[PDB]
Structure 1
Amino acid sequence: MRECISIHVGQAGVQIGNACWELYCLEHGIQPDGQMPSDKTIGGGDDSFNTFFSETGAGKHVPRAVFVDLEPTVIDEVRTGTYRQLFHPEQLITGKEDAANNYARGHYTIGKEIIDLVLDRIRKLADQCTGLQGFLVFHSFGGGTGSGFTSLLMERLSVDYGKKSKLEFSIYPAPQVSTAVVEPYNSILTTHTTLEHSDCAFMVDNEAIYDICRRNLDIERPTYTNLNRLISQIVSSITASLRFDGALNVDLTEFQTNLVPYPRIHFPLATYAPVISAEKAYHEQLSVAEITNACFEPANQMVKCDPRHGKYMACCLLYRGDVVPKDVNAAIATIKTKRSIQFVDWCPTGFKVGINYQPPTVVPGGDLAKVQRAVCMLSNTTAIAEAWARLDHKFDLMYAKRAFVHWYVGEGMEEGEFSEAREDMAALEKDYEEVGVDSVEGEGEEEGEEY
């Protein structure tokens, strides 16, 4: 029973959770009311996969989800929506104001009196679980709740459970586009928790996904629904290895064993290759080589960063559908001969491969074409440093004059939690710069004894 508990914090977290749970319900043939007529039609089976859904006596299936936010609006949209009967009635929503783009308000003042209930319900979910693999936390940098309350919850979880993996999916601020004036402060103040407590953090950018939607899917006016659906596809590709049979299955521990060389560099990028519209699904073969090559194109990255400016440290490919090992081997072999893709000299292997038989599903009303093959790549590289550096600059431009600071100090913080965070960012950037340097020439300086 490869059980995984999902936690959604903030508006971005709740909406990505809506998309994710729509996809999960469609994958296993669960109706919006929690019933599964597939078993009744067939007679019995294991289709109620215990990764996400828990089966009660009467044939209903309750998801292993925990939605949290400080605004009643975002989750009251779910309590009276299509999926109102699917979730347990307990949704952990503080009937008060919100963090208000304020890390201090979400971490110290209002984050209290809601953390205890959240931890209690997480404990109740964990008690029902046997062989719990880890957590999947969804949130967004730049928001008050998704920064402060996520920090508090991650701290408490690291205190309590400790050894269980805690993966992170977060929406990083874009370089140019933004939706708040105090995004850099909230983003920078979360580095301590996203570093010390998480085991692997996946970052995505709205500008990159908008570019992908405009260029590949030919959607000129996308909304957040398309972005959430793409992120849901990414998470499903990650988690499919422990729900369906396959030639090579990759658990959540193999992830961390293969992708993170050192504890402090666990920030891999993610990407999905066969992102294509229904009309353009024709005129294309969609073979293993094509999707595998498209995973490495800088235009297809989900974060505004150029891999050509850095070096690849580790790669994990997860294939779905009608795929065979020899095509994957040929794709990796032809990739290794390209000079535009550089690997660090101290990781000569540089690839982890997993294959799953279940092909990706299509959500009605969606925009992704039905395909026979797919691949999700997760790549730990050094180009991500750039994504920090720009944001770091922005932070300085506001902290030189102490703008917007009185709101933060008026809720419980002092200015030093505003420098300590900056120094931690600087140290992280120094680490990323140091790891990517080539080994010094003949690293034992030089050698050669008599004979």
Structure 2
Amino acid sequence: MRECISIHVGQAGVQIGNACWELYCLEHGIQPDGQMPDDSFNTFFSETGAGKHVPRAVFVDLEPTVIDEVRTGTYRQLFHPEQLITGKEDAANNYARGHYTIGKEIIDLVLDRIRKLADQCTGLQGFLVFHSFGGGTGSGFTSLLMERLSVDYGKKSKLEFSIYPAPQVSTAVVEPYNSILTTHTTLEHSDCAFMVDNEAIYDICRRNLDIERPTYTNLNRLISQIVSSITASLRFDGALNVDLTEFQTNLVPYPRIHFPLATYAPVISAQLSVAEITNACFEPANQMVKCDPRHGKYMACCLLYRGDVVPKDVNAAIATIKTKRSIQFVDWCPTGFKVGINYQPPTVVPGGDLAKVQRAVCMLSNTTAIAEAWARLDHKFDLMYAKRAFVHWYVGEGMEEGEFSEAREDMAALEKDYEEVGV
């Protein structure tokens, strides 16, 4: 067995978690009561003496409103009270408050609940951490938790699904600060981080789904499909990415450069060919992070097909784009793809705005172009830190001003590292 534990931190982490676990249940046929009429689903679901299947998941949100959703939601019976960790006061959009003030208060309780899940695993692979960059809890507590998971589970893999901040649906002016702070502290402690740019997801819901003002649920329905595509071979008996260690093997040649770009197709409003959805994988309008792959070189590239996909069609599709397009890999790395087909068909939430399709594909590529997302964030950080705007709210929580600049230097080195390898 190859159990994975999912950890959801902050509002974004929890509400996306609701979307994913809902979608998992629809894919694996688990009812909202936990009952269920391939045994790979046990990597994400444990089982109780009453025959109930329970997500291997912990939820952390120190604002009782959000976690009360999970307690009274549609899939509320899936979860046990010791998986839900709340408080009274959230981080108030403050990284220092989430990391230092509340972090010192709740970290042992949170690790204790994680330990109770890990004691039910015979072969724990590691962790899947869902959190925002911009929230004070999603950024501040997550970084403390990743620090401690490296201590308490040194040999275990840690993957993140990180929500990259966007003005359209922002919740705080200090989100660029929290973003740089949590990326700095987490950098050594994550093996593979899939960033989800809220602006890219916003643009996809408007263009491809004909939604004027996408909600959190709109974005989360689309994000769940990507998470599902990334975890599908863990939850079913697939061939590619069959354990967390294989993600850094197939995508992360250098440990700091561990931020793959996700492209997904098709997104259809509620039947395209293998060649069409394959072409869509190379259109930046389908990326989950806004950047231009023409401004970079690939280090690794995997194609994760789902549903009715036959190998001869894939290899014909790949052959077509090779002749018409230039796809620059770095010198030291082979120019090509790792392809995986998962026969399990793409599933949508019934009544949602996503239509059921016959076949889908998610491309995971490690391009140096994703450094552009870091450059946009680093500039907004620079605009405010030059005047020390808002810094006093972070210092008031016991954080030292030097940590701002020490974090920013690490983001400077990360930008240079992306330059060096994209030479």
Q: 1:344 to 1:402 in 2, by over 3 A?
A: same
Contact 1:313/1:350, CA 8 A, preserved across alignment: no
Contact 2:9/2:131, CA 8 A, preserved across alignment: yes
The structural deviation recorded for 1:223 is 0.9
SS in 1 for 2:54: strand
> Deviation string for 1:263-311 (max 9, x for gaps)?
11001111211111249xxxxxx11111111011011111121212222
Contact 1:250/1:354, CA 8 A, preserved across alignment: no
Take 1:92 and 1:334, find their aligned partners in 2: how far apart are those partners? Answer: 49
**5+ residue gaps in structure 1?**
38-45, 280-285, 437-451
The structural deviation recorded for 1:409 is 0.7
Number of the residue aligned with 2:301: 315
Q: TM-score w.r.t. structure 2 length?
A: 0.95
Take 2:56 and 2:234, find their aligned partners in 1: how far apart are those partners? Answer: 15
> Deviation string for 1:321-342 (max 9, x for gaps)?
1212222222222222234432
Which moves more between the two structures, 50-59 or 61-70?
A: 50-59
SS in 1 for 2:306: strand
Take 2:279 and 2:145, find their aligned partners in 1: how far apart are those partners? Answer: 39
The structural deviation recorded for 1:416 is 0.7
> Deviation string for 1:15-50 (max 9, x for gaps)?
00110111011111111111124xxxxxxxx55821
Which moves more between the two structures, 65-74 or 81-90?
A: 81-90
Which moves more between the two structures, 92-101 or 406-415?
A: 92-101
The structural deviation recorded for 1:212 is 0.9
Contact 1:270/1:378, CA 8 A, preserved across alignment: yes
RMSD (CA atoms): 1.8
Contact 2:40/2:235, CA 8 A, preserved across alignment: no
The structural deviation recorded for 1:186 is 0.7
**Structure 1 residue 13 corresponds to structure 2 residue 13:** yes
Name the % identity.
100
Take 2:132 and 2:139, find their aligned partners in 1: how far apart are those partners? Answer: 7
Structure with bigger helix share is 2
> Deviation string for 1:154-191 (max 9, x for gaps)?
00000110111111001112377633111111111112
Take 1:24 and 1:15, find their aligned partners in 2: how far apart are those partners? Answer: 14
Take 2:86 and 2:305, find their aligned partners in 1: how far apart are those partners? Answer: 41
Which moves more between the two structures, 336-345 or 252-261?
A: 336-345
**Structure 1 residue 109 corresponds to structure 2 residue 104:** no
Please, which of 181, 189, 203 is the counterpart of residue 211 of structure 1? 203
Take 1:120 and 1:177, find their aligned partners in 2: how far apart are those partners? Answer: 34
Number of the residue aligned with 1:447: none
Contact 1:92/1:118, CA 8 A, preserved across alignment: no
Take 1:387 and 1:119, find their aligned partners in 2: how far apart are those partners? Answer: 32
Q: 1:222 to 1:176 in 2, by over 3 A?
A: closer
Q: 1:14 to 1:333 in 2, by over 3 A?
A: same
> Deviation string for 1:91-148 (max 9, x for gaps)?
4434321111111111111212211111011111111111222211000001100111
The structural deviation recorded for 1:375 is 0.8
Number of the residue aligned with 2:67: 75
Contact 2:3/2:42, CA 8 A, preserved across alignment: yes
> Deviation string for 1:203-225 (max 9, x for gaps)?
11111111111111222232111
Q: 1:413 to 1:245 in 2, by over 3 A?
A: closer
> Deviation string for 1:335-381 (max 9, x for gaps)?
22234432223222331111111111121121222122111111110
Contact 1:71/1:93, CA 8 A, preserved across alignment: no
Q: TM-score w.r.t. structure 1 length?
A: 0.90
SS in 1 for 2:104: coil
Q: 1:246 to 1:400 in 2, by over 3 A?
A: closer
The structural deviation recorded for 1:246 is 4.5
Contact 2:163/2:195, CA 8 A, preserved across alignment: yes
Take 2:344 and 2:357, find their aligned partners in 1: how far apart are those partners? Answer: 12
Q: 1:125 to 1:248 in 2, by over 3 A?
A: closer
Q: 1:389 to 1:32 in 2, by over 3 A?
A: same
SS in 2 for 1:302: coil
Q: 1:78 to 1:94 in 2, by over 3 A?
A: closer
SS in 1 for 2:149: helix
Contact 2:62/2:85, CA 8 A, preserved across alignment: yes
Contact 1:272/1:295, CA 8 A, preserved across alignment: yes
Q: 1:175 to 1:424 in 2, by over 3 A?
A: farther
Contact 1:322/1:359, CA 8 A, preserved across alignment: yes
Q: 1:378 to 1:129 in 2, by over 3 A?
A: same
Take 2:219 and 2:207, find their aligned partners in 1: how far apart are those partners? Answer: 14
SS in 2 for 1:104: helix
Take 2:71 and 2:239, find their aligned partners in 1: how far apart are those partners? Answer: 40
Structure 1 stretches (4+) deviating beyond 6 angstroms? none
Contact 1:237/1:376, CA 8 A, preserved across alignment: yes
**5+ residue gaps in structure 2?**
none
Number of the residue aligned with 2:403: 417
Structure exhibiting the larger radius of gyration computed from Cα positions? 1
